[PDB]
Design a protein around this ligand. Structure first.
Ligand SMILES: CC(C)(COP(=O)(O)OP(=O)(O)OC[C@H]1O[C@@H](n2cnc3c(N)ncnc32)[C@H](O)[C@@H]1OP(=O)(O)O)[C@@H](O)C(=O)NCCC(=O)NCCSC(=O)C[C@@](O)(CC(=O)O)C(=O)O
Ligand SMILES: CC(=O)SCCNC(=O)CCNC(=O)[C@H](O)C(C)(C)COP(=O)(O)OP(=O)(O)OC[C@H]1O[C@@H](n2cnc3c(N)ncnc32)[C@H](O)[C@@H]1OP(=O)(O)O
Ligand SMILES: CC(=O)SCCNC(=O)CCNC(=O)[C@H](O)C(C)(C)COP(=O)(O)OP(=O)(O)OC[C@H]1O[C@@H](n2cnc3c(N)ncnc32)[C@H](O)[C@@H]1OP(=O)(O)O
Ligand SMILES: Nc1ncnc2c1ncn2[C@@H]1O[C@H](COP(=O)(O)OP(=O)(O)O)[C@@H](O)[C@H]1O
Ligand SMILES: O=C([O-])CC(=O)C(=O)O
Ligand SMILES: O=C([O-])CC(=O)C(=O)O
Lengths: 1037, 92, 181
């Protein structure tokens, strides 16, 4: 989208970035004057003010300043100081817009004569860039396109100095031909290097000292921000005069520029009572046209749109921003929120409406005390759930919300919100039934919708032959052909896909705005591709022009970027056109018709689908060429195709504001090239009722001249012989009348309605509706991965970290689903610490080291070490705990327990040490025992184990409570002595092996440490010495 | 019941082409088990069917059997046998 | 068994599952040491057909972040002396979020970059020691030790719920066996 930049920014960029042999004068030599600044600082940082003369003019995107007396020429510092006060901060009226004066520019006065008043204008066109030079420029420039010399520079073509000298310098003075020509060349390099779309210097004054750019008006391609970021810096786009910028608009612009989706917001009247939530640029344009058609232009507050399938978070942010905007003031008549839109092709209505209802619930109070009434109309994917959540939020919040679906004609809600009605070479045939397409990008939903469309169209083969995704290896992706399961190849590179599929003739490019250009350029290197569909929005106009030039050279038809694509009922479908399969069947797009339509918008293309299905036989072919300034194929490129197609009988055109394209259709009708009936409507009639220059959501929706207004186009088409309705409301009626008149003469013969093949319902869609029953095969109660926040056994992770538990608390939550006390978690941590490692001589550490010295893996080595954890090694914890628990519960005294163990030929688990007996204890048993004594409330089993330990140490000193036995008895005591567990729960946790898990988790740290040690020491493969192995093999078996 | 009527669509999350457990007879890569035993292949033939989905010649299956025979064991001093013995002596 | 079940679960820890820690750490360390700016790193990853490890989430993008990345990032900001690699990763995260919102620093990527910063920013390690510990898979061990707690908890949950033997439904398996081999 071309956005006008201020004079100061334009001159700043020109001075910093132009590269000319001519000595550009007054580089960075200017001052900015605003109401909210001091004046001494302006003198101190700009000492040149006193040095020479001054001239002041408001830098607020206002033209005709000299004719309106807004410029003070040849005034000193005191002169301009006295000049500003009667105008600085005052009110002024230019054309139709009234506004303040918050910006002024001070620059040195240049002593120049009228003989050097030059004019240099470079503006972009579809075929290239027009550069116009006028020797007698300035105020007396007069007509420019008829008197000033014009020169075209084509796409990917350089502006040579010789051509500037010859074509552009016929009447220029000879003494200044050369340096000026070099300056012109540098200016063109500045225009095409910073992605400018308009650059008019008027006047340009060159004297013997050098060149001076007195004034310049510049419009730059904003969508090229990702290319010219370092050169633009923090570039700012001033709003049109009479309109003040708002922080909410900047926030929405940042949100739009932060993602590939479109989020346009423009505040026209903050005092207004009508606010809109319309999805789709054309949908928002027609909604605004309806609003100002009933006299709500003055009370219309904002123009807004959300497109490109915005996420739930993005839609919530947009809705909350507009709700904050709408709840500032109060209105005696109340306020209206029009949440409109077309029948969405791929915009998830459910997620966007969930975000909207979240914003409404966050703002329910101010909304209900503002008497805000909400009218919602929407269709598309999962619109039933969106309308349902709208109804529930309106019921719960108390907001009067009226929700409607497809059956509404998209404009009843506007009329009955303000109270008017009651509230209830390039080929001709691009696609055929044998068309095979390659899809760039991982878009499984779009390809599945394409396959469903093909199946319900009784196609022999799927229309998608292969997919291209550069971020994965070649494989096969699983898709549905009706109910059958099929595989579609996915290739990393274009070359392999075109090698294995020479029958592919169409590319559907789902690459982003940062990859669509390169992908399309690579695709046009293969001659088999005749049609390319570009879905990305926000491509720079220069790159799009390069794409158009290459496509015209190669004779490849391009469906312009920022489009949903197109639909040919019975033959082919592009991307997400026509919505899901339910919308395809509702609009009967599985069978050919007799009406062919072309529109700029994608959602309006689905609206046209619905209208044509309702009122006529059906749709033969529908193409959306995109909202960009330069579509790959224009209106004429498709109207000519339809006129050459015998299958169509009438053509419907849905144009927009800006662009002299419908006049080409008018000329073709005049010359008799177009004979079939045409019904055309141009949206954008509200732009003539606006005291502004508001830019619509579509990039190309901007009326440059006065002949590109929608009203003028519609008027000319009415005198062109085109059936033009009074408004978009009457479009359905006029199309129906034309269809009836054409079928009454026998031109149209509707075919027999053959029922389409049926496609089985989606399992997820059926589960969402609650139509089917499938039992869950798994149960879990320790962790909830789904949702906004991770949950550990009912506790959010943020609350887990705020409660200041550590490994012990998380372990308790995950293993026992209990909120353990602080001492229990700390004791669990100590148990993990003391069982971390016990040297490399144990079986598990030995196995881990053996697997590590084989250079296998961390996971494999740790796993091999852990697989030895069992009865003989690492099981003394659970065994000791079970033995002591059984002894304590049996009621036998410790001496009886010792005697029973002795007479059964069993050694007491957890009793006995190797060196440390008494007066030199374990130093691991002591720390844990002290902690348990100090912190545990009651330790019955620990006392029983200590009595058993006394009895065993009365036999021989080294029969002490082991670390395993102590940890087991203390873990049982913690389980059955804290309030978290009942006795049954503790017994079950002991039975299932909680202490086995404790030991394994503790020793895993040591095993991983051993693996890391062996990999750091770079130890080679181990082989056991033969002298350590006794071979007792039989004599001969 | 809905799947039997063909009323709903649920893509399969897994793919397999080496063995068909369902049906009247067990199938090894398109070959019935009774036909597997009647064709008189052994470990080599079943290995070829399960790993390559191919009906290998008799000499190929026999060679696979010889390869399995010669790699059966190489004493207890190797790392794998050592680890197996360590885990076994732990009574796991 | 507890050991067998935990072991079977841990044996899936590798490249596709549980390896985003080490992969993200290595990628960001290589980018930072190569001296390339974050934009150059993003362009180099894009033109090589590789996705940046540790970047991208499923639902949580902005104004609703991970709630696990935030806590660790706040702790690192408050307590770590210097975080050069974390700042580089945050610039990369800004560049990726300028493309589409859900391209944020993952828990895996954040933990990897913060672990590298801790290794090479505390006085305990020299640069060679930190590089060697990253190369040998210290973050793999970190992830395995962390996830072992959850695996043992899952085993205990399944043994408490007394769930029977599982057999995968035949309707969820596509049989593409040949005609006759
Ligand atoms: C274009 C696309 C399809 C796909 O682009 P996406 O950005 O989504 O996905 P990606 O291709 O992956 O790009 C992201 C970049 O991040 C990179 N990346 C990913 N992961 C990464 C990782 N882990 N590490 C590093 N990098 C990573 C990835 O490599 C890429 O890098 P890059 O190539 O340089 O960009 C999407 O933008 C889109 O949908 N456009 C819609 C525009 C359009 O046609 N409008 C007209 C149709 S009518 C309408 O819309 C209005 C209406 O509402 C009507 C109504 O309702 O009335 C309706 O709907 O009909
Ligand atoms: C996990 C734990 O805390 S221990 C597990 C708990 N198990 C039990 O308590 C079950 C009942 N208790 C018992 O089985 C016994 O009382 C034991 C094993 C605990 C007591 O150990 P002992 O029978 O004396 O055998 P021990 O393991 O001490 O080995 C004997 C000697 O070899 C030495 N030794 C131990 N490991 C090694 C090795 N890798 N290489 C060389 N020498 C070793 C020891 O220093 C010990 O010294 P000593 O000669 O002074 O006795
Ligand atoms: C360990 C970590 O923190 S992740 C580390 C991963 N490694 C990387 O970071 C490498 C780079 N990143 C990426 O590969 C990608 O950007 C990703 C995978 C992280 C981003 O994820 P996506 O590509 O969107 O796939 P994702 O995992 O979100 O799955 C898609 C959807 O399935 C849903 N889903 C996830 N798991 C399940 C499940 N078990 N059952 C059903 N649905 C599920 C998700 O909610 C998600 O929602 P969406 O439809 O709104 O996107
Ligand atoms: N630096 C300067 N030195 C001398 N005169 C200047 C300078 N800048 C502007 N002017 C005067 O301003 C007039 C140009 O008005 P301009 O701002 O181009 O009108 P508009 O706002 O309609 O473009 C010229 O006639 C010129 O005399
Ligand atoms: O810790 C002990 O004393 C016994 C041992 O070696 C182990 O299993 O770790
Ligand atoms: O944590 C994530 O977001 C990715 C994941 O599922 C895992 O490996 O645990």
């Amino acid at each position: 989208s071309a956005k006008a930049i201020s004079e100061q920014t334009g001159k700043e960029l020109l001075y910093k970035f132009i590269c000319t042999t001519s000595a550009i004068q007054n580089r960075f030599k200017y001052a900015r004057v605003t109401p909210d600044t001091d004046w001494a600082r302006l003198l101190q940082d700009h000492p040149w003010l006193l040095s020479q003369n001054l001239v002041v003019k408001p830098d607020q995107l206002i033209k005709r300043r000299g004719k309106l007396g807004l410029v003070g020429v040849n005034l000193t510092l005191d002169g301009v100081k006295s000049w500003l006060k009667p105008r600085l901060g005052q009110e002024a009226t230019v054309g139709k817009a009234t506004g303040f004066l918050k910006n002024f520019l001070i620059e040195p006065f240049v002593p120049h004569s009228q003989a050097e008043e030059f004019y240099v204008c470079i503006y972009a066109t579809r075929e290239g860039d027009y550069v116009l030079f006028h020797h007698e420029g300035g105020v007396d420039v007069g007509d420019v396109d008829a008197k000033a010399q014009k020169l075209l520079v084509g796409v990917d073509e350089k502006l040579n100095p010789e051509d500037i000298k010859k074509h552009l310098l016929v009447h220029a003075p000879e003494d200044k031909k050369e340096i000026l020509a070099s300056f012109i060349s540098g200016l063109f390099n500045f225009y095409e290097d910073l992605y400018f779309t308009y650059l008019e210097i008027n006047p340009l004054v060159v004297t013997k000292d050098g060149v001076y750019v007195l004034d310049l008006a510049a419009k730059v391609d904003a969508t090229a921000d990702y290319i010219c970021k370092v050169k633009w810096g923090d570039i700012e786009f001033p709003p049109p005069f009479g309109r003040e910028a708002y922080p909410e608009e900047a926030y929405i612009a940042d949100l739009d520029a932060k993602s590939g989706a479109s989020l346009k917001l423009t505040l026209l009247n903050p005092k207004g009572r009508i606010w809109t939530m319309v999805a789709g640029g054309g949908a928002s344009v027609v909604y605004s046209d309806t609003i100002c058609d009933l006299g709500g232009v003055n009370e219309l507050a904002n123009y807004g749109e959300y497109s490109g399938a915005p996420s739930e978070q993005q839609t919530y942010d947009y809705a909350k921003t507009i709700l904050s905007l709408m709840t500032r003031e109060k209105h005696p008549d109340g306020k209206i929120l029009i949440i409109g839109g077309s029948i969405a092709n791929f915009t998830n209505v459910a997620a966007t409406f969930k975000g909207i209802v979240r914003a409404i619930r966050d703002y329910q109070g101010p909304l209900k005390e503002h008497e805000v009434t909400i009218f919602v109309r929407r269709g598309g994917p999962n619109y039933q759930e969106g309308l349902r959540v709208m109804g529930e939020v309106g019921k719960t919040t108390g907001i009067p919300i009226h929700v409607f679906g497809t059956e509404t004609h998209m404009t009843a809600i506007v009329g009955m919100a303000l109270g008017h009605r009651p509230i209830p070479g390039k080929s001709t045939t691009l696609f055929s039934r044998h068309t095979k397409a390659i899809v760039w990008g991982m878009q499984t939903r779009a390809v599945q919708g394409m396959l469903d469309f093909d199946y319900v169209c009784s196609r022999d083969e799927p229309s998608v032959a292969a997919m291209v995704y550069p971020f994965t290896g070649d494989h096969k992706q699983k898709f549905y052909w009706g109910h059958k399961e099929i595989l579609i190849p996915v290739f990393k590179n274009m070359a392999d896909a075109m090698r294995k599929h020479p029958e592919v003739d169409v590319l559907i490019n789902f690459a982003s705005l940062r990859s669509a250009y390169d992908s399309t350029m690579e695709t046009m290197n293969y001659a088999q591709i005749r049609t390319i569909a570009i879905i990305a929005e926000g491509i720079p106009e220069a790159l799009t022009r390069k794409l158009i030039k290459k496509a015209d050279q190669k004779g490849v038809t391009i469906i312009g970027p920022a489009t949903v694509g197109g639909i040919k009922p019975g033959c082919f479908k592009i991307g997400n056109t026509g919505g899901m399969l339910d919308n395809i069947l509702a609009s009967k797009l599985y069978r050919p018709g007799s009406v062919a339509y072309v529109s700029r918008s994608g959602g309006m293309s689905n609206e046209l689908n619905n209208i044509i299905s309702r009122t006529t036989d059906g749709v033969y072919e529908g193409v959306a060429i995109g909202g960009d300034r330069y579509p790959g194929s224009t209106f004429m490129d498709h109207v000519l195709r339809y006129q050459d197609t015998p299958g169509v009988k009438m053509i419907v055109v849905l144009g927009e504001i800006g662009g002299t394209e419908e006049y080409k259709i008018c000329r073709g009708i005049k010359e008799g090239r177009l004979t079939k009936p045409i019904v055309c409507w141009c949206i954008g009639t509200c732009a003539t009722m606006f005291s502004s220059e508001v830019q619509f959501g579509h990039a190309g929706a901007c009326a440059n001249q006065a002949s590109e207004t929608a009203v003028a186009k519609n008027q000319a088409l009415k005198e062109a012989g085109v059936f033009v309705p009074r408004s978009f409301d009457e479009l359905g009626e006029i199309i129906q009348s034309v269809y009836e008149d054409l079928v009454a003469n026998g031109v149209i013969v509707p075919a027999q309605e053959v029922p389409p093949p049926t496609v089985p319902m989606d399992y997820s869609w059926a589960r969402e509706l609650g139509l089917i029953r499938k039992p869950a095969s798994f149960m879990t109660s320790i962790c909830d991965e789904r949702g906004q926040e991770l949950i550990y056994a009912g506790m959010p992770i943020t609350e887990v970290f705020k409660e200041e538990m550590g490994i012990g608390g998380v372990l308790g939550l995950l293993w026992f689903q209990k909120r353990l006390p602080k001492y229990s978690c700390q004791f669990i941590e100590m148990c993990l610490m003391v069982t971390a490692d016990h040297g490399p001589a144990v079986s598990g550490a030995h196995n881990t080291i053996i697997c590590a010295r084989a250079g296998k893996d961390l996971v494999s080595s740790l796993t091999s070490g852990l697989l030895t954890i069992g009865d003989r090694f690492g099981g003394a914890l659970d065994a000791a705990a079970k033995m002591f628990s059984k002894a304590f519960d049996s009621g036998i005294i410790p001496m009886e327990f010792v005697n029973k163990m002795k007479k059964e030929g069993k050694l007491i688990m957890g009793i006995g040490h190797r060196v440390k007996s008494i007066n030199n204890p374990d130093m691991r048993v002591q720390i844990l025992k002290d902690y348990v004594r100090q912190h545990f409330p009651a330790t019955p089993l620990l006392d029983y184990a200590l009595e058993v330990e006394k009895i065993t140490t009365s036999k021989k000193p080294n029969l002490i409570l082991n670390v395993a036995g102590l940890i087991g008895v203390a873990f049982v005591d913690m389980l059955r002595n804290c309030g978290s567990f009942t006795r049954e729960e503790a017994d079950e946790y002991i039975d299932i092996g909680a202490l086995n898990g404790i030991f394994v988790l503790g020793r895993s740290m040591g095993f991983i440490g051993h693996y890391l040690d062996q990999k750091r020491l770079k130890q080679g493969l181990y082989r056991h010495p033969w002298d350590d192995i006794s071979y007792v093999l039989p004599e001969h078996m």
